[PDB]
Design a protein around this ligand. Structure first.
Ligand code: MG
Ligand code: MG
Length: 132
RNA sequence: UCGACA
DNA sequence: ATGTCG
């Protein structure tokens, strides 16, 4: 039940919170579609969030109806609810990560999309293809 | 309390 | 250990 005609996104971080990054790829070819420039500091869940919303953008501007695979239970939800509920403090250091996270919001609720966002069954299918 | 996904 | 959710 793996829909290979999809986009699988995942985040790679160093410490949580800390240096964060994500990337989307073709669930099958493993081809790297979009990659995020390593952010200074940010939580994992925010990483996931952005990873998804970015992929959401990527598709819409290519007119793709491919669903999205994320193993972030927290983000898949945040996104469904168009609301990132991150408890990370807002200070000049968590600037960029919060800047982005907000724009991802300003987008979610100012756009349309039927793009399915699906949970990747890591326990049954192994690490997601966009994994580091 | 724990459980779950990262 | 921390980030989040149920
Ligand atoms: Mg992940
Ligand atoms: Mg991973």
């Amino acid at each position: 039940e793996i829909i290979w005609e999809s986009l699988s996104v995942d985040v790679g971080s160093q410490g949580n919170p800390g240096i964060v990054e994500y990337k989307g790829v073709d669930t099958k070819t493993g081809e790297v579609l979009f990659e995020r420039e390593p952010i200074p500091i940010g939580t994992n869940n925010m990483g996931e969030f952005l990873a998804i919303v970015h992929g959401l953008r990527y598709l819409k501007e290519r007119n793709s109806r491919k669903p999205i695979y994320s193993n972030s239970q927290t983000a898949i939800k945040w996104v469904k609810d168009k609301k990132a509920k991150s408890t990370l403090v807002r200070n000049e250091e968590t600037a960029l990560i919060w800047k982005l996270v907000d724009e991802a919001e300003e987008w979610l609720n100012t756009h349309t999309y039927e793009t399915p966002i699906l949970k990747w069954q890591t326990d049954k299918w192994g690490e997601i293809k966009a994994d580091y």
